[PDB]
Structure 1
């Protein structure tokens, strides 16, 4: 599926923007941190699906209603924002 359509449909848009921080981090900032680190895509994909806490602040990202192929698609698209 298309990452831009997923970003809207799966509710990501409610907590994230690409350039500014809303509830979670800006995607440009995420892409910058995980730069070109080996294995980052799989690691972000897991956090998109099962949740995250502590990396960008004290508040959690709740687990998302996405499948594994959807999380990989989204992780790859977030990293391309750098």
Structure 2
């Protein structure tokens, strides 16, 4: 289904926020810091399927069971949030 739909079925909208700061960096904000990358949604998918720290803060994102294609839409979904 749509990318956002995935954010709810996996729980991505639980620690993140299209703009408000919660457990992780806002979604749109994430694109503001990585903006300029030649494909940050692809690597974002590799870091979204395994999660990790040294990314935004000392709180490594818990790895999710999102297939590679689902984590790819999850990456472009964050940079496309509102």
- TM-score of the aligned structures, taking structure 2 as reference length: 0.90
Aligned length: 82
Structure 1 unmatched runs, 5+: none
What is the CA RMSD across the aligned residues, in angstroms? 1.4
> What are the Cα deviations for residues 13-59 of structure 1, in whole angstroms up to 9, with x where unaligned?
11011111111110111010111311312110101111121121101
| TM-score, length-scaled by structure 1 | 0.90
TM-aligned CA deviation for residue 4 of structure 1: 1.1
Find runs of 4+ consecutive structure 1 residues off by over 4 angstroms: none
Q: Which residue of structure 2 aligns with residue 13 of structure 1? A: 13
